Amino acid sequence: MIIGYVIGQATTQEALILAERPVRLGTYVVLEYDNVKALGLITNVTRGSPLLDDNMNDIEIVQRLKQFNNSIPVYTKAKVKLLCDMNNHFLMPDIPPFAGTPAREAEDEELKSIYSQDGQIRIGSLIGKNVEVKLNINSFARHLAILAATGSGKSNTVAVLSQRISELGGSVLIFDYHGEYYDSDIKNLNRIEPKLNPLYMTPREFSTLLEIRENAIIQYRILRRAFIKVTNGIRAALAAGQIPFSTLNSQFYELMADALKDEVLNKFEEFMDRYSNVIDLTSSDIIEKVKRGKVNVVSLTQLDEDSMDAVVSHYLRRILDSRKDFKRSKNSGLKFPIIAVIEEAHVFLSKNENTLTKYWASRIAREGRKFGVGLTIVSQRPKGLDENILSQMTNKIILKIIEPTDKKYILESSDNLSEDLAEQLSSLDVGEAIIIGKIVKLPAVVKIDMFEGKLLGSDPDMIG
């Protein structure tokens, strides 16, 4: 269906069309000229009048014109981002379109050829069209950033993605900040409680939690000797059957307090006061608690800022080290690839702050691909995310962003986002998104499916 023709100046990646039919953001269009089949995306759309223009100042003339019938000339103009040339193996158009080049609505066959065949995980469909958008699953190892303003559909995206992946036999680990997935009717759900077991920690890790640097050789020595001593003693006592699980946490407190000098002691006691609600030597390792083909969800719902940081960083570290061990030995460690999802990531990943999660998020961002560990970060404040972590997020599902410095922030943290695409992020609607990265073959404007279930609310009763 011919909806318009090319007018004015055009380059190899941008053109202007005059339309005969109404068009809008997210509309895909084909421009055929020479041996070039140029796929274009409608971005900006404006309407005007040669008669009733900006400098029209007489209201009475307009009122008279209304008394008549369709006696006013109007136009519709639309900017077109030229994506590729379908004739030349989907490369860039090597020649601009001629003025007068007809622009037609893209066909289902063409769109499905691009957005449905190279993908496995369905995220939704194109706007207006009946074309399913499928994401390439292996490309998730190149990590994902889900960004949007408040209430635009970040968590709905996570829910849909987690479900479809699990249905494809994939494994996901969601850190649930508000308890949205933990109390939902999502399929393949695997509930995990936040526990910190020192028996599955390293002395390095235990030192970091106690805010003890490893280069602090005096304190670290005292701590490492003591920690190894007490853990070994407890394990030997469990094998000998001389420590009941009814009394295992308390014993660990007193044993460590005995094996320890004042700085280590101060930080250790503060560690047990600050993380009391989390420490559990009875709890199994997170690796055993994580199930394949399941949407594994860790509840952070009744934890504080510090406790959250400690739990997530531990599980991240455990996952990464385990996946490494599996690549090396093939007879131990996490046997299947996993995708870790950090909700409310701007709480953990700020640049002006140094949390434990940010360190291990960065590690996974640089290593995770080699060990089958994909990372997904979800936030509403892009500029509150570390540049180094955001820039390593190759794949990006960006819903509505209206704050301009946020747009620029995503642009400078992306290597595959164009400024003219970023300029239309404010015109996005709830559930609509611009999807970039290797998860798609070309930049995709998508309507994301509504999660068939029902996620728990995050807003509590403020009256009672």
Task: Pick one of 43, 139, 152, 155: the residue that binds Mg ion (CB under 5 A).
Answer: 155
CB of 242 to its own copies, least distance (A): 27
Q: Taking CB under 6 A as the rule, does residue 148 contact ligand ANP?
A: yes
Q: Taking CB under 8 A as the rule, does residue 87 contact its own copies?
A: no
Please give the full DSSP string across 368-408, using - where no structure is assigned.
Answer: GGGGTEEEEEEES-GGGS-HHHHTT--EEEE-----HHHHH
Rounded to 10 deg, the angle between the 217-240 and 262-274 helix axes is 60
Can you say how many angstroms the Cα of residue 265 is from the centroid of all Cα atoms in its chain?
40
Dist. CA 255–CA 268, nearest whole Å: 12
Q: Pick from 340, 303, 302, 296: which is nearest to 318 by CA?
A: 340
Dihedral angle at the C-alpha atoms of 385, 342, 314, 348, nearest 10 degrees?
30
Phi, psi of 376 (to 5 degrees): -125, 125
Task: Pick one of 237, 257, 430, 456: the residue that binds its own copies (CB under 8 A).
Answer: 430
Scan for tokens 């070994």, then name that residue.
232
Q: Greatest CA separation found in the chain?
A: 100
CB of 434 to its own copies, least distance (A): 14
Output the 3-class SS for 222-274. HHHHHHHHHHHHHHHHHHHCCCCHHHCHHHHHHHHHHHCCHHHHHHHHHHHHH
Task: Pick one of 113, 116, 219, 283: the residue that binds its own copies (CB under 8 A).
Answer: 219
What would the two tokens of residue 7 be?
A: 């007018």
Q: Which partner, its own copies, ligand ANP, Mg ion, none, binds residue 450 by CB below 5 to 8 Å per kind?
A: ligand ANP
Sole window of 95-103, 154-162, 210-218, 350-358 interacting with Mg ion (rule: CB under 5 A):
154-162
In the DSSP assignment, the letter for residue 410 is H
Q: Pick from 205, 211, 270, 213: which is nearest to 231 by CA?
A: 205
Q: Which partner, ligand ANP, its own copies, Mg ion, none, binds residue 448 by CB below 5 to 8 Å per kind?
A: ligand ANP
Task: Tell whether residue 154 is among the known ligand binding residues.
Answer: yes
Applying the rule CB under 6 A, the residues between 380 and 409 that interact with ligand ANP are 380
Task: Pick one of 64, 104, 221, 235: the residue that binds its own copies (CB under 8 A).
Answer: 221
CB of 408 to its own copies, least distance (A): 9
- Tell me the HSE value of 146 on the side-chain side, using a 13 A CA sphere: 27
Contact 382, 406 (CB under 8 A): yes
Task: Tell whether residue 142 is among the known ligand binding residues.
Answer: yes
Phi, psi of 41 (to 5 degrees): -120, 125
Using the minimum distance from each CB to Mg ion, give the nearer residue, 147 or 410: 147
Sole window of 34-42, 192-200, 212-220, 442-450 interacting with ligand ANP (rule: CB under 6 A):
442-450
CB of 457 to ligand ANP, least distance (A): 9
Q: Which partner, its own copies, ligand ANP, Mg ion, none, binds residue 163 by CB below 5 to 8 Å per kind?
A: none
Q: Taking CB under 6 A as the rule, does residue 458 contact ligand ANP?
A: yes
Applying the rule CB under 6 A, the residues between 412 and 441 that interact with ligand ANP are 430-431
Applying the rule CB under 8 A, the residues between 104 and 133 that interact with its own copies are none
Q: Taking CB under 6 A as the rule, does residue 379 contact ligand ANP?
A: no
Phi, psi of 220 (to 5 degrees): -65, -35
CB of 234 to its own copies, least distance (A): 19
Q: Which residues bind ligand ANP (CB under 6 A)?
A: 148, 150-156, 380, 430-431, 448-450, 458
User: What residues form the annotated binding site for ATP?
Assistant: 142, 151-156, 447-448
